[model samples]
Target: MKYLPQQDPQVFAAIEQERKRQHAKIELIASENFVSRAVMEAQGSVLTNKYAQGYPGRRYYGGCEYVDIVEELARERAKQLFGAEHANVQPHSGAQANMAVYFTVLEHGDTVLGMNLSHGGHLTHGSPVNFSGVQYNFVAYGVDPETHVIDYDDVREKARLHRPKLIVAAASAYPRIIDFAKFREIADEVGAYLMVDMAHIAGLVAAGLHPNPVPYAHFVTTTTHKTLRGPRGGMILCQEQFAKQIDKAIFPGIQGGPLMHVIAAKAVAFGEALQDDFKAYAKRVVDNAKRLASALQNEGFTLVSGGTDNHLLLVDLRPQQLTGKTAEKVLDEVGITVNKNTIPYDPESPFVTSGIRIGTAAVTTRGFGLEEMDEIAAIIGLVLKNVGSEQALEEARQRVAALTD
Candidate 1:
């Protein structure tokens, strides 16, 4: 079968329209990236027809020989890419991986420590609305008010006081490099285990552009998408001590059959990441982010936590006299898509947040470089200066349309 089973021209037209939208827009969402064609091919391959319910060499059903090769390759490639002692590529997303780890290490009502959501923490990191917070005794730590960065001292205090059963080290909007070593030390001091969620920066870590968390973290989890730029999927990496727990937790403990096609795509993506060019691409991603952040700063925008060390940065829109929602809408009008994000200590809600998060990963994948990032920053600056100026936005929109192939 063809990639898309289109019986009509309208279907092809719709696909082209979506492709054009993606090409014309400067996608600035911090948690999104463009996957390669090879990865996408594997994602749409015949492997999707299989139902591989168990690990390699042990299956609960028949017709999994080919799937066994696919899964084992994914596992081995994941271990090689991340330097993990054990790897599981079966979980569907980073959230499920979090569930597996939580189930593996904690019991009902067990105390858990994670970052506060509005202060750059993920929902699974212990927001009251999430399962982790509802099922477990969750304690949250926040960043320093003045610096807008996580306070390791505060984390240690929380750990020592709560003595949580598990300590989670990860964030959604943190703009600096996290110290996994320090987190490990805190866990040891309180006799707790550490789970590092490197979901957002897996690509950087794999390419050595960012520090790997394996040496310090007891267990590490990540989504294969985002900066890794593969099909959407999740993985778990742990030490041999917790291997059994992780396996059981991921299988009957949480999920049933795995997404075999996603595993195949991950296998392909892991191979691509091992290439020398991937390292270069990862470094360029960081460099482009720094350039874009500086450009925005030069245009009078306050970058949260000063700037970024990875593929994305958060811009506080309040100082520009524009709500983040308005900034997002205006930018979207100009075909530069970005998401409103909660700034540290944001007075506004998540829907109308005080900040917007921007990244260069997608644009970089589309062959955008430092020069293009500056132009994109300039567009963001203009949108901020004239929030409701449709005429100006339309002009910028034309520029974006012209840039698309």
Candidate 2:
């Protein structure tokens, strides 16, 4: 018996429509990607039936041998791919993995030095509305106004003055390549542990296209999706000394039974990441992003951090007399999907931000290259420039339909 309606022709028809549409269109959303058919199959496998509530060997349930094998494979593959000393493939998502790290390494009300949300940091890295901010005191470091880049000196000063117990190095929107070594140096100077969240660039780092933080940071966290392009889930890596705390924190502290089926899929992604083909894909993803960002700049959109060194670019819309919300809507109507993001020290509130984030990770996963990048950039530029005046909507609508067709 299937949980979904297998006999409903409409349901299956919608699925087919979506698949075909996906095949024909571009997906510029930075945090999204397509997974392999084998990975999708694993997510639907019999392993989903088990409720292995603990670590592989110390599971709270019986008959966990096969699940254990898959889990171990994921853990080891993660370590090998990233050169991490230890790995935990169990957190349900990146947020949960970060939560586990905080729980294991910090106490309530402890000070944390992190980047501000408006300055390209993730929510889990200490946004006020998130648990990381509400529960702990956060000293946020922003970017250099002139260059639109992170001011590492400011971060180090904050670390020295505030004396935060944990220093977080991660981002969602900042385009330049990060210097994990410099972050580590600051953390060491202040006698704090460094936690690097590489969810956005894990694929690049693993492929050696970008700098790896494995040798510098103490605890590393990431999701299996995004640039990794696997199942939707999270993983953690740490030194051996913190393994017990990190594991216990993830199991009893944050999550319950592991998503064994997803873990199996993660194993597949990790193994694939070790192949030469994956590295080539990583390079293509970066190249396409640069092309798109250049196209946007040529159309008069201000890019935060000047341009991208990795996968995503933050487009500052103020110069074009547009708001993030409006730009997002216009582009969505044009059959392009991207999210509104906050530029460094954005003056507007989160609800109506000043920037939009775009990337080529998703499109690259769908087999698009530089040619597709140029076309997508033109569509977005035209819609943003022409929308909201004299039949522009219909013009974009028709163009979008033709592109997809």
Q: TM-score for all predictions? A: 0.96, 0.94
lDDT of each residue in 80-197, candidate 2, tens digit only: 9999889999999999999999999899999999887778889888878899989899888878987878899999999999999999998877788889999999999999999999
Clashing residue pairs in candidate 1 are none
Candidate with the greatest TM-score versus the true structure:
1
Model 2, C-alpha of 318: deviation from truth (Å):
1.4
- The candidate that achieves the highest lDDT relative to the unseen native structure: 1
The alpha-carbon lDDT assigned to residue 105 of candidate 1 equals 85
28-143 in candidate 1: lDDT tens per residue? 88888888888888888888888788799888889999899989999898899988899989999999999999999888999999988888889898878889889999898888
In candidate 1 the C-alpha lDDT for residue 66 amounts to 89
Candidate 2, position 295, lDDT: 81
Model 2: ten consecutive residues of lowest lDDT? 1-10
- What lDDT score goes with residue 198 in model 1? 93
